[PDB]
């Protein structure tokens, strides 16, 4: 149900709390803006910015694809400069495309007491690692990143199903932690280990 087709759109990467984007329920990392007021956003150009500007204090209708739910939804958003912060929406985006987006996640399984994972605040079963400050586009890439950060702090971005929020954690892999490996938690990857739909 995307008029115009294609998988291009604007990947929402930041949503400031209490912004018009936040009030509309835009979710960082998972949401892709695919149209605004029925205009398909399938090109990297100024259409989105200009339509927001033309509609300051006027509700607009966005069509959004979520890589969390794998569904399209419509959201009403009111661009405004009266909410206290900077920008009409209070979001940051990059032109992108949503096909494959839901696959690059790593499911936190059991977490051992006193492990590097425990210390970082990783939560068994409900946490999903969604990325880091370097590219990870294959199953083994989180494990490679962990290897390359032996005894070094590593920033991970993490979604939690219970709070339904994303956060940043810092983990320091450590092969001398006392138990197996450098992490001390299980990690799942693949169709059984994606964010519950």
């Amino acid at each position: 149900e995307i008029p115009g087709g294609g998988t291009e759109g604007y990947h929402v990467l930041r949503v400031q709390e209490n912004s018009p984007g936040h009030r509309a329920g835009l979710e960082p990392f998972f949401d892709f803006i695919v149209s605004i007021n029925g205009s398909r956003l399938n090109k990297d150009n100024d259409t989105l910015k200009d339509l927001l500007k033309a509609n300051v204090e006027k509700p607009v209708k966005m069509l959004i694809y979520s890589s969390k739910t794998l569904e399209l939804r419509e959201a009403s958003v009111t661009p405004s400069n009266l909410w206290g912060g900077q920008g009409l929406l209070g979001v940051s985006i990059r032109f992108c495309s949503f096909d494959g987006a839901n696959e690059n996640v790593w499911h936190v399984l059991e977490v051992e007491s006193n492990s590097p994972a425990a210390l970082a605040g990783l939560r068994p079963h409900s946490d999903y690692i969604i990325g880091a400050d370097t590219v990870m586009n294959e199953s083994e890439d989180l494990f490679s990143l962990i290897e390359t950060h032996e005894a070094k702090p590593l920033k991970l971005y993490v979604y939690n199903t219970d709070t339904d929020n994303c956060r940043e954690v810092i983990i320091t892999p450590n092969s001398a932690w006392g138990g197996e490996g450098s992490l001390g938690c299980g990690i799942g990857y693949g169709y059984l280990h994606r964010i519950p739909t």
Partner: peptide, 21 residues
């Protein structure tokens, strides 16, 4: 643990420049 106003710039498909709107 950081939780606020985070930019999750960790997508390998993103092509365009990072824009604040």
């Amino acid at each position: 643990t950081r939780y606020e106003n985070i930019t999750f710039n960790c997508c390998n498909h993103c092509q365009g420049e990072l824009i604040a709107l």
